[PDB]
Protein backbone atom coordinates (compact mmCIF):
# COMPACT_ATOMS: atom_id res chain seq x y z
CA UNK A 1 0.00 0.00 0.00
CA UNK A 2 0.94 3.69 -0.07
CA UNK A 3 3.85 4.44 2.21
CA UNK A 4 6.56 6.99 2.95
CA UNK A 5 9.75 6.95 4.98
CA UNK A 6 11.27 10.07 6.47
CA UNK A 7 14.49 10.46 8.39
CA UNK A 8 16.80 13.26 9.47
CA UNK A 9 20.53 12.85 9.04
CA UNK A 10 23.24 15.35 9.96
CA UNK A 11 20.79 18.22 9.70
CA UNK A 12 19.07 17.22 6.42
CA UNK A 13 15.44 16.00 6.53
CA UNK A 14 14.66 13.47 3.80
CA UNK A 15 11.33 11.95 2.70
CA UNK A 16 11.12 8.77 0.59
CA UNK A 17 7.91 8.08 -1.34
CA UNK A 18 8.20 4.34 -1.61
CA UNK A 19 6.13 3.34 -4.63
CA UNK A 20 7.20 6.14 -6.95
CA UNK A 21 10.85 6.29 -5.93
CA UNK A 22 10.52 10.04 -5.40
CA UNK A 23 12.91 11.53 -2.83
CA UNK A 24 12.41 14.93 -1.22
CA UNK A 25 14.39 17.32 0.96
CA UNK A 26 11.99 19.03 3.38
CA UNK A 27 12.15 21.70 6.05
CA UNK A 28 11.34 21.05 9.71
CA UNK A 29 7.68 22.05 9.48
CA UNK A 30 6.94 19.75 6.56
CA UNK A 31 8.74 16.93 8.38
CA UNK A 32 6.41 17.42 11.38
CA UNK A 33 3.22 17.72 9.32
CA UNK A 34 4.02 14.40 7.64
CA UNK A 35 3.59 12.67 11.03
CA UNK A 36 -0.10 13.50 10.79
CA UNK A 37 -0.99 14.22 7.16
CA UNK A 38 -2.74 10.91 6.42
CA UNK A 39 -4.81 10.47 9.59
CA UNK A 40 -5.83 14.03 10.47
CA UNK A 41 -7.51 16.99 8.82
CA UNK A 42 -5.84 20.35 8.20
CA UNK A 43 -7.72 21.81 11.15
CA UNK A 44 -6.61 19.07 13.54
CA UNK A 45 -3.01 19.37 12.33
CA UNK A 46 -3.04 23.13 12.84
CA UNK A 47 -4.09 22.55 16.46
CA UNK A 48 -1.61 19.71 17.07
CA UNK A 49 1.35 21.85 15.95
CA UNK A 50 0.12 25.28 17.08
CA UNK A 51 2.62 25.38 19.95
CA UNK A 52 5.47 25.49 17.38
CA UNK A 53 4.12 26.71 14.01
CA UNK A 54 1.53 29.35 13.16
CA UNK A 55 -1.55 28.49 11.12
CA UNK A 56 -0.49 30.37 7.98
CA UNK A 57 2.88 28.65 7.60
CA UNK A 58 1.24 25.26 8.23
CA UNK A 59 -1.37 25.80 5.51
CA UNK A 60 1.52 26.87 3.25
CA UNK A 61 3.48 23.68 3.83
CA UNK A 62 0.19 21.78 3.69
CA UNK A 63 -0.63 23.28 0.28
CA UNK A 64 2.71 21.94 -0.97
CA UNK A 65 2.14 18.42 0.41
CA UNK A 66 -1.13 17.40 -1.26
CA UNK A 67 0.03 19.13 -4.43
CA UNK A 68 2.88 16.59 -4.35
CA UNK A 69 0.39 13.79 -3.61
CA UNK A 70 -1.97 14.94 -6.36
CA UNK A 71 0.87 14.38 -8.84
CA UNK A 72 2.05 11.04 -7.48
CA UNK A 73 5.18 12.02 -5.56
CA UNK A 74 3.93 11.34 -1.99
CA UNK A 75 1.82 8.42 -0.74
CA UNK A 76 1.59 7.14 -4.30
CA UNK A 77 0.08 3.72 -4.98
CA UNK A 78 2.01 0.76 -6.45
CA UNK A 79 1.38 0.44 -10.23
CA UNK A 80 3.24 -2.88 -10.52
CA UNK A 81 1.16 -4.61 -7.82
CA UNK A 82 -1.52 -6.22 -10.03
CA UNK A 83 1.00 -7.61 -12.51
CA UNK A 84 3.35 -9.53 -10.18
CA UNK A 85 0.92 -12.43 -9.52
CA UNK A 86 3.06 -14.77 -11.67
CA UNK A 87 4.94 -17.82 -10.42
CA UNK A 88 5.32 -19.93 -13.59
CA UNK A 89 8.16 -17.71 -14.91
CA UNK A 90 10.79 -19.73 -16.74
CA UNK A 91 14.07 -18.67 -15.18
CA UNK A 92 17.00 -17.63 -17.37
CA UNK A 93 20.47 -18.23 -15.96
CA UNK A 94 22.53 -15.13 -16.70
CA UNK A 95 25.73 -15.74 -14.72
CA UNK A 96 27.85 -18.53 -13.26
CA UNK A 97 30.21 -18.31 -10.32
CA UNK A 98 32.94 -20.88 -11.17
CA UNK A 99 34.73 -22.39 -8.15
CA UNK A 100 37.92 -22.75 -10.17
CA UNK A 101 39.62 -24.31 -7.13
CA UNK A 102 38.57 -25.26 -3.60
CA UNK A 103 42.16 -25.06 -2.48
CA UNK A 104 43.63 -21.77 -1.36
CA UNK A 105 46.83 -20.41 0.14
CA UNK A 106 45.08 -18.55 2.99
CA UNK A 107 42.75 -19.57 5.80
CA UNK A 108 40.66 -16.42 6.03
CA UNK A 109 38.61 -17.07 9.07
CA UNK A 110 35.15 -15.67 8.10
CA UNK A 111 35.33 -17.64 4.83
CA UNK A 112 33.38 -20.71 3.70
CA UNK A 113 36.72 -22.12 2.49
CA UNK A 114 37.77 -22.36 6.16
CA UNK A 115 40.51 -29.45 -2.18
CA UNK A 116 40.14 -29.89 -5.90
CA UNK A 117 41.08 -27.99 -9.05
CA UNK A 118 38.34 -27.63 -11.64
CA UNK A 119 39.19 -29.50 -14.83
CA UNK A 120 39.05 -27.77 -18.19
CA UNK A 121 36.36 -30.33 -19.08
CA UNK A 122 34.10 -29.27 -16.18
CA UNK A 123 34.67 -25.61 -17.01
CA UNK A 124 33.71 -26.28 -20.63
CA UNK A 125 30.59 -28.07 -19.37
CA UNK A 126 29.80 -25.00 -17.23
CA UNK A 127 30.05 -22.78 -20.32
CA UNK A 128 27.77 -25.07 -22.36
CA UNK A 129 25.33 -25.31 -19.46
CA UNK A 130 25.14 -21.49 -19.24
CA UNK A 131 24.54 -21.18 -22.99
CA UNK A 132 21.65 -23.68 -22.99
CA UNK A 133 20.11 -22.17 -19.83
CA UNK A 134 20.49 -18.51 -20.87
CA UNK A 135 17.91 -18.88 -23.64
CA UNK A 136 17.98 -15.80 -25.84
CA UNK A 137 20.08 -13.53 -23.61
CA UNK A 138 23.25 -12.39 -25.35
CA UNK A 139 25.22 -10.97 -22.40
CA UNK A 140 26.49 -13.70 -20.05
CA UNK A 141 28.73 -13.31 -16.99
CA UNK A 142 31.42 -15.68 -15.66
CA UNK A 143 33.02 -14.98 -12.28
CA UNK A 144 36.27 -16.87 -11.73
CA UNK A 145 36.05 -17.71 -8.06
CA UNK A 146 36.42 -20.52 -5.63
CA UNK A 147 39.08 -20.58 -3.11
CA UNK A 148 41.93 -18.96 -5.00
CA UNK A 149 41.26 -19.15 -8.79
CA UNK A 150 44.82 -18.17 -9.77
CA UNK A 151 46.05 -21.46 -8.42
CA UNK A 152 44.40 -23.02 -11.50
CA UNK A 153 44.96 -20.16 -13.92
CA UNK A 154 45.58 -22.34 -16.97
CA UNK A 155 42.03 -23.66 -16.70
CA UNK A 156 40.76 -20.06 -16.47
CA UNK A 157 42.47 -19.23 -19.78
CA UNK A 158 41.11 -22.31 -21.54
CA UNK A 159 37.62 -21.45 -20.33
CA UNK A 160 37.93 -17.96 -21.78
CA UNK A 161 39.17 -19.19 -25.17
CA UNK A 162 36.47 -21.88 -25.21
CA UNK A 163 33.73 -19.39 -24.36
CA UNK A 164 35.20 -16.77 -26.70
CA UNK A 165 34.81 -19.23 -29.60
CA UNK A 166 31.25 -20.28 -28.69
CA UNK A 167 30.13 -16.64 -28.95
CA UNK A 168 29.80 -16.58 -32.75
CA UNK A 169 27.55 -19.64 -33.15
CA UNK A 170 25.22 -18.67 -30.29
CA UNK A 171 25.18 -14.85 -30.53
CA UNK A 172 26.63 -14.65 -27.01
CA UNK A 173 29.00 -12.12 -25.43
CA UNK A 174 30.87 -13.27 -22.32
CA UNK A 175 32.10 -10.83 -19.67
CA UNK A 176 34.63 -12.34 -17.25
CA UNK A 177 35.31 -11.36 -13.63
CA UNK A 178 38.19 -12.58 -11.47
CA UNK A 179 38.30 -12.35 -7.67
CA UNK A 180 41.70 -13.03 -6.13
CA UNK A 181 43.48 -12.80 -2.79
CA UNK A 182 46.42 -11.36 -4.76
CA UNK A 183 49.20 -13.63 -3.47
CA UNK A 184 49.91 -15.10 -6.93
CA UNK A 185 49.66 -11.98 -9.12
CA UNK A 186 52.67 -10.93 -11.18
CA UNK A 187 53.50 -8.77 -14.17
CA UNK A 188 52.72 -11.45 -16.76
CA UNK A 189 49.33 -12.65 -15.52
CA UNK A 190 48.20 -9.09 -14.83
CA UNK A 191 48.94 -8.31 -18.49
CA UNK A 192 46.66 -11.24 -19.42
CA UNK A 193 44.06 -10.05 -16.87
CA UNK A 194 43.95 -6.56 -18.37
CA UNK A 195 43.51 -8.11 -21.81
CA UNK A 196 40.73 -10.53 -20.83
CA UNK A 197 39.03 -9.70 -17.47
CA UNK A 198 36.35 -7.07 -17.80
CA UNK A 199 36.43 -6.77 -14.00
CA UNK A 200 38.79 -7.84 -11.22
CA UNK A 201 38.06 -7.88 -7.50
CA UNK A 202 40.97 -7.52 -5.10
CA UNK A 203 40.45 -8.75 -1.54
CA UNK A 204 41.89 -6.63 1.29
CA UNK A 205 40.04 -5.72 4.48
CA UNK A 206 41.54 -2.30 5.19
CA UNK A 207 44.18 -1.45 7.78
CA UNK A 208 47.05 -3.91 8.06
CA UNK A 209 46.05 -4.98 11.57
CA UNK A 210 42.43 -5.54 10.51
CA UNK A 211 43.48 -7.41 7.35
CA UNK A 212 46.19 -9.57 8.91
CA UNK A 213 43.94 -10.45 11.87
CA UNK A 214 41.49 -12.19 9.49
CA UNK A 215 43.27 -13.04 6.21
CA UNK A 216 45.88 -15.55 7.36
CA UNK A 217 48.34 -17.91 5.68
CA UNK A 218 48.44 -21.50 6.88
CA UNK A 219 51.47 -20.58 9.03
CA UNK A 220 49.44 -17.78 10.63
CA UNK A 221 51.19 -14.66 9.30
CA UNK A 222 49.47 -11.83 7.45
CA UNK A 223 49.27 -11.00 3.75
CA UNK A 224 48.87 -7.19 3.74
CA UNK A 225 52.52 -6.38 2.93
CA UNK A 226 52.53 -8.83 0.02
CA UNK A 227 49.23 -7.98 -1.64
CA UNK A 228 49.07 -4.18 -1.15
CA UNK A 229 51.69 -3.17 -3.82
CA UNK A 230 50.33 -5.73 -6.27
CA UNK A 231 46.85 -4.24 -5.84
CA UNK A 232 47.98 -0.63 -6.40
CA UNK A 233 49.82 -1.82 -9.51
CA UNK A 234 46.63 -3.52 -10.78
CA UNK A 235 44.52 -0.48 -9.88
CA UNK A 236 46.83 1.90 -11.74
CA UNK A 237 47.37 -0.41 -14.73
CA UNK A 238 43.57 -0.33 -15.16
CA UNK A 239 43.43 3.51 -14.89
CA UNK A 240 41.70 3.21 -11.50
CA UNK A 241 38.67 1.70 -13.27
CA UNK A 242 37.03 -1.68 -13.89
CA UNK A 243 38.23 -3.07 -10.54
CA UNK A 244 37.52 -2.69 -6.90
CA UNK A 245 39.23 -3.58 -3.65
CA UNK A 246 36.82 -5.66 -1.60
CA UNK A 247 36.88 -5.76 2.18
CA UNK A 248 34.74 -7.68 4.68
CA UNK A 249 34.06 -6.12 8.08
CA UNK A 250 33.09 -8.12 11.15
CA UNK A 251 32.42 -7.54 14.83
CA UNK A 252 36.23 -7.30 15.18
CA UNK A 253 36.40 -4.07 13.15
CA UNK A 254 33.19 -2.16 13.79
CA UNK A 255 35.09 1.15 13.26
CA UNK A 256 35.12 0.19 9.58
CA UNK A 257 35.12 3.78 8.30
CA UNK A 258 38.79 3.74 9.35
CA UNK A 259 39.33 0.82 6.96
CA UNK A 260 37.49 2.35 3.99
CA UNK A 261 39.45 5.57 4.52
CA UNK A 262 42.72 3.66 4.79
CA UNK A 263 42.08 2.09 1.37
CA UNK A 264 41.15 5.52 0.05
CA UNK A 265 44.34 7.04 1.51
CA UNK A 266 46.30 4.34 -0.33
CA UNK A 267 44.97 5.54 -3.69
CA UNK A 268 42.11 3.12 -4.41
CA UNK A 269 39.34 4.97 -6.24
CA UNK A 270 37.01 1.93 -6.25
CA UNK A 271 36.19 0.40 -2.85
CA UNK A 272 33.63 -1.99 -1.46
CA UNK A 273 33.64 -2.86 2.24
CA UNK A 274 30.71 -5.07 3.24
CA UNK A 275 29.36 -6.79 6.37
CA UNK A 276 30.29 -10.45 6.91
CA UNK A 277 27.78 -13.00 5.55
CA UNK A 278 26.52 -16.14 7.35
CA UNK A 279 28.51 -15.60 10.54
CA UNK A 280 26.00 -17.10 13.00
CA UNK A 281 27.57 -18.33 16.25
CA UNK A 282 30.98 -17.34 14.89
CA UNK A 283 32.13 -14.69 17.25
CA UNK A 284 31.99 -12.32 14.20
CA UNK A 285 28.43 -11.53 13.31
CA UNK A 286 27.21 -8.02 13.84
CA UNK A 287 24.47 -8.21 16.46
CA UNK A 288 21.43 -6.09 17.22
CA UNK A 289 23.35 -4.48 20.11
CA UNK A 290 25.92 -3.26 17.57
CA UNK A 291 23.53 -1.38 15.26
CA UNK A 292 23.87 2.07 16.97
CA UNK A 293 27.68 2.01 16.63
CA UNK A 294 27.47 0.78 13.04
CA UNK A 295 24.86 3.42 12.18
CA UNK A 296 27.12 6.17 13.47
CA UNK A 297 29.99 4.60 11.51
CA UNK A 298 28.09 4.74 8.19
CA UNK A 299 27.13 8.34 8.90
CA UNK A 300 30.67 9.40 9.65
CA UNK A 301 31.83 7.61 6.48
CA UNK A 302 29.17 9.39 4.40
CA UNK A 303 30.15 12.83 5.74
CA UNK A 304 33.81 12.22 4.88
CA UNK A 305 32.72 10.78 1.53
CA UNK A 306 30.98 14.04 0.57
CA UNK A 307 33.95 16.07 1.82
CA UNK A 308 36.53 14.20 -0.29
CA UNK A 309 34.31 14.38 -3.37
CA UNK A 310 33.92 18.12 -2.76
CA UNK A 311 37.68 18.63 -2.28
CA UNK A 312 38.64 16.43 -5.23
CA UNK A 313 40.37 13.49 -3.50
CA UNK A 314 37.39 11.40 -4.46
CA UNK A 315 36.77 7.69 -4.16
CA UNK A 316 33.77 5.48 -4.99
CA UNK A 317 32.15 3.35 -2.25
CA UNK A 318 29.90 0.65 -3.72
CA UNK A 319 27.28 0.70 -0.97
CA UNK A 320 26.82 4.50 -1.37
CA UNK A 321 26.10 4.32 -5.08
CA UNK A 322 22.43 4.47 -5.93
CA UNK A 323 20.35 5.28 -9.00
CA UNK A 324 17.43 7.61 -8.33
CA UNK A 325 15.90 6.94 -11.80
CA UNK A 326 13.82 3.74 -11.70
CA UNK A 327 9.59 -4.38 -11.53
CA UNK A 328 12.30 -6.59 -13.05
CA UNK A 329 14.74 -5.47 -10.36
CA UNK A 330 12.23 -5.92 -7.55
CA UNK A 331 11.66 -9.61 -8.42
CA UNK A 332 15.27 -10.72 -8.90
CA UNK A 333 17.58 -9.68 -6.05
CA UNK A 334 21.14 -11.06 -6.20
CA UNK A 335 19.64 -13.91 -8.25
CA UNK A 336 21.13 -16.84 -6.31
CA UNK A 337 19.37 -20.15 -6.96
CA UNK A 338 17.65 -19.03 -10.19
CA UNK A 339 19.53 -16.39 -12.24
CA UNK A 340 22.95 -16.79 -10.65
CA UNK A 341 24.47 -20.18 -9.79
CA UNK A 342 27.77 -21.52 -8.46
CA UNK A 343 29.60 -24.55 -9.91
CA UNK A 344 32.12 -26.63 -7.91
CA UNK A 345 35.36 -28.06 -9.34
CA UNK A 346 33.51 -31.39 -9.24
CA UNK A 347 30.88 -29.61 -11.35
CA UNK A 348 28.05 -29.61 -8.78
CA UNK A 349 25.51 -26.77 -9.03
CA UNK A 350 24.50 -24.68 -5.99
CA UNK A 351 22.50 -21.43 -5.56
CA UNK A 352 25.65 -19.50 -4.65
CA UNK A 353 29.03 -19.96 -3.05
CA UNK A 354 27.53 -19.72 0.44
CA UNK A 355 25.41 -22.87 -0.11
CA UNK A 356 28.10 -25.06 -1.73
CA UNK A 357 28.75 -26.83 1.55
CA UNK A 358 25.24 -28.37 1.75
CA UNK A 359 23.93 -31.09 -0.58
CA UNK A 360 20.33 -30.31 0.44
CA UNK A 361 20.88 -27.41 -1.98
CA UNK A 362 22.69 -29.29 -4.74
CA UNK A 363 20.69 -28.76 -7.92
CA UNK A 364 22.58 -30.96 -10.40
CA UNK A 365 25.98 -31.17 -12.02
CA UNK A 366 27.11 -29.43 -15.18
CA UNK A 367 28.63 -32.59 -16.61
CA UNK A 368 25.00 -33.75 -17.14
CA UNK A 369 23.30 -30.37 -17.50
CA UNK A 370 20.00 -31.24 -15.76
CA UNK A 371 18.99 -28.56 -13.25
CA UNK A 372 16.57 -29.21 -10.37
CA UNK A 373 13.76 -26.85 -11.41
CA UNK A 374 11.93 -27.06 -8.09
CA UNK A 375 14.87 -25.59 -6.21
CA UNK A 376 15.33 -22.99 -8.96
CA UNK A 377 11.68 -21.96 -8.72
CA UNK A 378 11.77 -21.87 -4.89
CA UNK A 379 14.63 -19.35 -4.85
CA UNK A 380 13.01 -17.44 -7.75
CA UNK A 381 9.73 -17.01 -5.86
CA UNK A 382 11.40 -15.93 -2.60
CA UNK A 383 11.65 -12.19 -3.21
CA UNK A 384 10.61 -8.73 -2.03
CA UNK A 385 7.07 -9.11 -3.43
CA UNK A 386 6.45 -12.43 -1.65
CA UNK A 387 8.20 -12.01 1.73
CA UNK A 388 5.73 -10.54 4.22
CA UNK A 389 8.38 -8.52 6.05
CA UNK A 390 9.51 -6.81 2.84
CA UNK A 391 5.96 -5.76 2.05
CA UNK A 392 5.87 -3.30 4.93
CA UNK A 393 9.50 -2.27 4.40
CA UNK A 394 10.16 1.21 3.01
CA UNK A 395 13.44 0.15 1.34
CA UNK A 396 11.78 -2.58 -0.78
CA UNK A 397 12.59 -0.87 -4.10
CA UNK A 398 16.06 0.34 -3.10
CA UNK A 399 17.41 -2.65 -1.27
CA UNK A 400 19.41 -5.38 -2.95
CA UNK A 401 16.63 -7.84 -2.00
CA UNK A 402 18.15 -9.55 1.03
CA UNK A 403 20.56 -12.42 1.16
CA UNK A 404 19.23 -15.97 1.08
CA UNK A 405 22.49 -17.19 2.61
CA UNK A 406 22.04 -14.96 5.68
CA UNK A 407 18.39 -15.97 5.89
CA UNK A 408 19.19 -19.69 5.81
CA UNK A 409 22.20 -19.27 8.10
CA UNK A 410 20.22 -17.49 10.82
CA UNK A 411 16.70 -18.97 10.43
CA UNK A 412 17.06 -22.14 8.30
CA UNK A 413 14.60 -20.58 5.86
CA UNK A 414 15.55 -18.40 2.91
CA UNK A 415 12.22 -16.55 3.22
CA UNK A 416 12.76 -15.13 6.74
CA UNK A 417 14.55 -11.78 6.69
CA UNK A 418 17.80 -11.42 8.60
CA UNK A 419 16.92 -8.36 10.67
CA UNK A 420 20.48 -7.12 11.35
CA UNK A 421 21.13 -7.39 7.61
CA UNK A 422 18.01 -5.35 6.75
CA UNK A 423 18.83 -2.57 9.24
CA UNK A 424 22.39 -2.26 7.91
CA UNK A 425 20.95 -2.29 4.40
CA UNK A 426 18.34 0.36 5.21
CA UNK A 427 20.92 2.58 6.90
CA UNK A 428 23.21 2.31 3.87
CA UNK A 429 20.37 3.48 1.63
CA UNK A 430 19.61 6.38 3.98
CA UNK A 431 23.29 7.40 3.72
CA UNK A 432 23.32 7.10 -0.07
CA UNK A 433 20.24 9.33 -0.16
CA UNK A 434 21.81 11.95 2.14
CA UNK A 435 24.89 11.96 -0.12
CA UNK A 436 22.72 12.69 -3.17
CA UNK A 437 21.03 15.46 -1.17
CA UNK A 438 24.38 17.04 -0.29
CA UNK A 439 25.46 17.17 -3.95
CA UNK A 440 22.37 18.71 -5.56
Amino acid sequence: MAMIHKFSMMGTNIVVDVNSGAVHVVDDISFDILDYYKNFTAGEIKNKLAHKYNADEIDEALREIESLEAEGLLFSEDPYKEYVSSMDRKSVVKALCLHISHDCNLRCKYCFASRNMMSLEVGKKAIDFLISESGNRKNLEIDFFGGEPMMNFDVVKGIIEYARQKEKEHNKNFRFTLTTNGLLLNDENIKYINENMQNIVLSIDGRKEVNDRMRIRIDGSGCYDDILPKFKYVAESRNQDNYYVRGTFTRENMDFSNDVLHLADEGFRQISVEPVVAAKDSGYDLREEDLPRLFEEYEKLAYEYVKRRKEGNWFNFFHFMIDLTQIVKRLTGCGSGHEYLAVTPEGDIYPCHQFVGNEKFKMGNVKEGVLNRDIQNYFKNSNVYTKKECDSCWAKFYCSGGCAANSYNFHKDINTVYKVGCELEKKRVECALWIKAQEM
Binding site: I14, V15, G21, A22, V23, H24, V25, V26, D27, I29, S30, E60, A61, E64, I65, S67, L68, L73, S272, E274, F318, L324, T325, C334, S336, Y340, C352, S400, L433, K436, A437, M440
Partner: peptide, 11 residues
Amino acid sequence: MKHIKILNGGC
Protein backbone atom coordinates in the same frame (compact mmCIF):
# COMPACT_ATOMS: atom_id res chain seq x y z
CA MET B 1 8.95 24.44 -3.90
CA LYS B 2 9.48 26.55 -0.77
CA HIS B 3 9.17 23.94 2.00
CA ILE B 4 9.78 20.82 -0.15
CA LYS B 5 12.59 20.24 -2.66
CA ILE B 6 12.27 17.25 -4.99
CA LEU B 7 15.58 15.39 -5.30
CA ASN B 8 14.89 13.18 -8.36
CA GLY B 9 12.64 15.11 -10.75
CA GLY B 10 28.61 -7.31 -3.69
CA CYS B 11 27.74 -10.61 -5.42
